[PDB]
PDB file of C-alpha atoms in Angstrom:
ATOM      1  CA  UNK Y   1      10.093  -8.218  -5.886  1.00 48.02           C
ATOM      2  CA  UNK Y   2      11.737  -9.016  -9.214  1.00 45.80           C
ATOM      3  CA  UNK Y   3      15.231  -7.562  -9.524  1.00 47.18           C
ATOM      4  CA  UNK Y   4      16.165  -6.538 -13.083  1.00 47.42           C
ATOM      5  CA  UNK Y   5      18.005  -3.532 -14.616  1.00 48.83           C
ATOM      6  CA  UNK Y   6      17.370  -0.292 -16.521  1.00 50.46           C
ATOM      7  CA  UNK Y   7      20.451   0.979 -18.328  1.00 46.85           C
ATOM      8  CA  UNK Y   8      22.985  -0.691 -16.052  1.00 45.99           C
ATOM      9  CA  UNK Y   9      21.094   0.445 -12.983  1.00 47.41           C
ATOM     10  CA  UNK Y  10      19.142  -1.873 -10.662  1.00 53.31           C
ATOM     11  CA  UNK Y  11      15.344  -1.875 -11.162  1.00 55.44           C
ATOM     12  CA  UNK Y  12      12.738  -3.162  -8.677  1.00 54.98           C
ATOM     13  CA  UNK Y  13       9.388  -4.553  -9.820  1.00 54.78           C
ATOM     14  CA  UNK Y  14       7.500  -4.347  -6.522  1.00 58.15           C
ATOM     15  CA  UNK Y  15       4.321  -6.335  -5.959  1.00 60.36           C
ATOM     16  CA  UNK Y  16       1.446  -5.648  -3.574  1.00 59.93           C
ATOM     17  CA  UNK Y  17       2.518  -7.993  -0.787  1.00 61.02           C
ATOM     18  CA  UNK Y  18       5.686  -6.011  -0.191  1.00 60.81           C
ATOM     19  CA  UNK Y  19       4.021  -2.778   0.891  1.00 63.87           C
ATOM     20  CA  UNK Y  20       5.505  -1.759   4.219  1.00 58.38           C
ATOM     21  CA  UNK Y  21       8.626  -3.872   4.173  1.00 59.25           C
ATOM     22  CA  UNK Y  22      12.289  -3.003   3.778  1.00 62.39           C
ATOM     23  CA  UNK Y  23      13.604  -3.900   0.323  1.00 62.22           C
ATOM     24  CA  UNK Y  24      17.029  -5.581   0.412  1.00 64.97           C
ATOM     25  CA  UNK Y  25      19.212  -6.786  -2.448  1.00 68.06           C
ATOM     26  CA  UNK Y  26      22.916  -7.597  -2.652  1.00 67.71           C
ATOM     27  CA  UNK Y  27      25.268  -5.551  -4.858  1.00 66.84           C
ATOM     28  CA  UNK Y  28      29.013  -5.553  -5.501  1.00 65.92           C
ATOM     29  CA  UNK Y  29      29.193  -2.517  -3.192  1.00 66.57           C
ATOM     30  CA  UNK Y  30      27.571  -4.372  -0.299  1.00 69.86           C
ATOM     31  CA  UNK Y  31      23.926  -4.785   0.671  1.00 73.07           C
ATOM     32  CA  UNK Y  32      21.465  -2.159  -0.571  1.00 72.59           C
ATOM     33  CA  UNK Y  33      18.416  -1.144   1.470  1.00 71.92           C
ATOM     34  CA  UNK Y  34      15.717   0.809  -0.364  1.00 74.90           C
ATOM     35  CA  UNK Y  35      12.743   2.181   1.483  1.00 76.06           C
ATOM     36  CA  UNK Y  36       9.368   2.299  -0.229  1.00 75.91           C
ATOM     37  CA  UNK Y  37       6.792   4.651   1.285  1.00 79.63           C
ATOM     38  CA  UNK Y  38       4.459   4.973  -1.724  1.00 79.38           C
ATOM     39  CA  UNK Y  39       0.916   5.353  -0.382  1.00 77.17           C
ATOM     40  CA  UNK Y  40      -0.572   4.464  -3.795  1.00 77.85           C
ATOM     41  CA  UNK Y  41       1.357   1.174  -4.069  1.00 80.91           C
ATOM     42  CA  UNK Y  42      -1.188  -1.393  -5.241  1.00 80.42           C
ATOM     43  CA  UNK Y  43      -1.468  -4.499  -7.409  1.00 80.04           C
ATOM     44  CA  UNK Y  44       0.891  -5.046 -10.332  1.00 78.84           C
ATOM     45  CA  UNK Y  45      -1.081  -4.355 -13.490  1.00 76.82           C
ATOM     46  CA  UNK Y  46      -1.148  -2.318 -16.711  1.00 80.02           C
ATOM     47  CA  UNK Y  47      -1.231   0.936 -14.815  1.00 80.05           C
ATOM     48  CA  UNK Y  48       2.383   0.995 -13.698  1.00 81.73           C
ATOM     49  CA  UNK Y  49       4.495   3.851 -12.693  1.00 83.13           C
ATOM     50  CA  UNK Y  50       8.253   3.814 -12.773  1.00 83.22           C
ATOM     51  CA  UNK Y  51      10.712   6.230 -11.228  1.00 82.22           C
ATOM     52  CA  UNK Y  52      13.967   6.548  -9.301  1.00 78.53           C
ATOM     53  CA  UNK Y  53      14.804   6.074  -5.651  1.00 81.24           C
ATOM     54  CA  UNK Y  54      17.799   8.339  -4.932  1.00 81.63           C
ATOM     55  CA  UNK Y  55      20.798   7.541  -2.794  1.00 78.74           C
ATOM     56  CA  UNK Y  56      20.548   9.318   0.523  1.00 77.62           C
ATOM     57  CA  UNK Y  57      23.510   9.531   2.876  1.00 79.13           C
ATOM     58  CA  UNK Y  58      22.834  11.165   6.261  1.00 80.98           C
ATOM     59  CA  UNK Y  59      20.187  13.500   4.809  1.00 78.17           C
ATOM     60  CA  UNK Y  60      16.515  13.521   5.727  1.00 76.05           C
ATOM     61  CA  UNK Y  61      14.157  12.679   2.823  1.00 79.10           C
ATOM     62  CA  UNK Y  62      12.100  15.489   1.335  1.00 77.32           C
ATOM     63  CA  UNK Y  63       9.373  15.401  -1.307  1.00 75.79           C
ATOM     64  CA  UNK Y  64       9.931  11.668  -2.041  1.00 73.70           C
ATOM     65  CA  UNK Y  65       8.509   8.273  -1.074  1.00 70.89           C
ATOM     66  CA  UNK Y  66      11.360   6.051  -2.227  1.00 72.63           C
ATOM     67  CA  UNK Y  67      15.081   6.048  -1.526  1.00 73.84           C
ATOM     68  CA  UNK Y  68      17.987   3.663  -1.068  1.00 71.80           C
ATOM     69  CA  UNK Y  69      21.066   4.066   1.115  1.00 72.87           C
ATOM     70  CA  UNK Y  70      23.859   2.532  -0.927  1.00 73.04           C
ATOM     71  CA  UNK Y  71      23.013   2.634  -4.597  1.00 74.63           C
ATOM     72  CA  UNK Y  72      20.348   4.595  -6.479  1.00 74.22           C
ATOM     73  CA  UNK Y  73      17.636   2.219  -7.716  1.00 77.46           C
ATOM     74  CA  UNK Y  74      14.714   2.420 -10.136  1.00 78.86           C
ATOM     75  CA  UNK Y  75      11.335   1.171  -8.884  1.00 78.98           C
ATOM     76  CA  UNK Y  76       8.131   0.073 -10.592  1.00 77.86           C
ATOM     77  CA  UNK Y  77       4.749  -0.897  -9.184  1.00 76.06           C
ATOM     78  CA  UNK Y  78       1.106  -0.986 -10.199  1.00 74.47           C
ATOM     79  CA  UNK Y  79      -1.668   1.160  -8.710  1.00 72.39           C
ATOM     80  CA  UNK Y  80      -4.607  -1.244  -9.256  1.00 70.77           C
ATOM     81  CA  UNK Y  81      -6.518  -2.658  -6.291  1.00 70.94           C
TER      82      UNK Y  81
ATOM     83  CA  UNK L 100       0.320   8.187   4.712  1.00 70.62           C
ATOM     84  CA  UNK L 101       2.956   6.329   6.731  1.00 67.92           C
ATOM     85  CA  UNK L 102       1.734   7.942   9.922  1.00 69.67           C
ATOM     86  CA  UNK L 103      -1.609   6.166   9.700  1.00 68.43           C
ATOM     87  CA  UNK L 104      -0.992   2.810   8.089  1.00 72.79           C
ATOM     88  CA  UNK L 105      -0.584   3.554   4.388  1.00 73.95           C
ATOM     89  CA  UNK L 106       2.294   2.822   2.050  1.00 73.77           C
ATOM     90  CA  UNK L 107       1.778   5.966  -0.040  1.00 73.94           C
ATOM     91  CA  UNK L 108       1.111   9.555   0.913  1.00 68.88           C
ATOM     92  CA  UNK L 109      -1.964  10.917  -0.826  1.00 66.94           C
ATOM     93  CA  UNK L 110      -5.726  11.243  -0.595  1.00 68.49           C
ATOM     94  CA  UNK L 111      -7.679   8.207   0.522  1.00 68.26           C
ATOM     95  CA  UNK L 112     -11.349   7.337   0.551  1.00 68.09           C
ATOM     96  CA  UNK L 113     -13.233   7.584   3.832  1.00 67.77           C
ATOM     97  CA  UNK L 114     -16.870   6.961   4.733  1.00 70.17           C
ATOM     98  CA  UNK L 115     -18.835   7.626   7.927  1.00 73.69           C
ATOM     99  CA  UNK L 116     -22.327   6.592   8.994  1.00 71.05           C
ATOM    100  CA  UNK L 117     -24.461   7.288  12.037  1.00 74.72           C
ATOM    101  CA  UNK L 118     -27.865   5.910  12.923  1.00 78.36           C
ATOM    102  CA  UNK L 119     -30.439   8.693  12.617  1.00 77.30           C
ATOM    103  CA  UNK L 120     -33.255   8.685  15.187  1.00 79.99           C
ATOM    104  CA  UNK L 121     -36.026  11.277  14.879  1.00 79.21           C
ATOM    105  CA  UNK L 122     -37.258  12.509  18.272  1.00 77.78           C
ATOM    106  CA  UNK L 123     -39.863  15.093  17.252  1.00 76.82           C
ATOM    107  CA  UNK L 124     -41.587  15.583  13.914  1.00 75.50           C
ATOM    108  CA  UNK L 125     -44.369  17.601  12.355  1.00 77.93           C
ATOM    109  CA  UNK L 126     -46.791  16.635   9.594  1.00 79.43           C
ATOM    110  CA  UNK L 127     -48.627  18.563   6.925  1.00 77.31           C
ATOM    111  CA  UNK L 128     -52.030  17.373   5.783  1.00 77.47           C
ATOM    112  CA  UNK L 129     -54.187  17.997   2.742  1.00 80.54           C
ATOM    113  CA  UNK L 130     -57.820  18.876   3.405  1.00 84.17           C
ATOM    114  CA  UNK L 131     -60.266  17.814   0.681  1.00 87.24           C
ATOM    115  CA  UNK L 132     -63.417  19.960   0.276  1.00 85.46           C
ATOM    116  CA  UNK L 133     -65.339  16.700   0.433  1.00 85.33           C
ATOM    117  CA  UNK L 134     -64.961  14.676   3.624  1.00 85.12           C
ATOM    118  CA  UNK L 135     -65.390  17.997   5.442  1.00 84.58           C
ATOM    119  CA  UNK L 136     -68.081  17.586   8.074  1.00 85.47           C
ATOM    120  CA  UNK L 137     -70.505  20.340   9.064  1.00 86.27           C
ATOM    121  CA  UNK L 138     -72.497  20.150  12.304  1.00 88.77           C
ATOM    122  CA  UNK L 139     -75.903  21.820  12.294  1.00 90.88           C
ATOM    123  CA  UNK L 140     -78.307  22.190  15.187  1.00 89.56           C
ATOM    124  CA  UNK L 141     -82.020  22.429  14.484  1.00 87.90           C
ATOM    125  CA  UNK L 142     -83.847  23.776  17.534  1.00 88.04           C
ATOM    126  CA  UNK L 143     -87.658  23.995  17.857  1.00 91.75           C
ATOM    127  CA  UNK L 144     -88.680  27.601  18.680  1.00 91.02           C
ATOM    128  CA  UNK L 145     -91.105  26.727  21.462  1.00 92.29           C
ATOM    129  CA  UNK L 146     -89.980  28.807  24.408  1.00 95.00           C
ATOM    130  CA  UNK L 147     -90.078  25.778  26.743  1.00 93.93           C
ATOM    131  CA  UNK L 148     -87.711  25.910  29.722  1.00 95.89           C
TER     132      UNK L 148
END
């Protein structure tokens, strides 16, 4: 995935071949591990969706398919197939 | 969803097929007035035995 930013915050452009794998990227505050569970994750195209993966410390996830454990991150991926 | 091999939770497309083998059938036919065949017996009134 391409690591960029959105208003000072880290942003992940996730491609199709990354579905199902732990997303890791270094940050001043250590190594960040985001987890992508999006069922509709497809091919990067015009039909993108973009949203935030909250920071989750010792809390079970609820009503979400993306989250990181060290620093909140934005994520973007296409839905095409 | 994640529990069955998908990255995203949501509705997915599924398709199922089964070979269909008929074991007993019925058939309806159309009877044309023509092509009907009448059998008539013509017997000589002789009284022979």
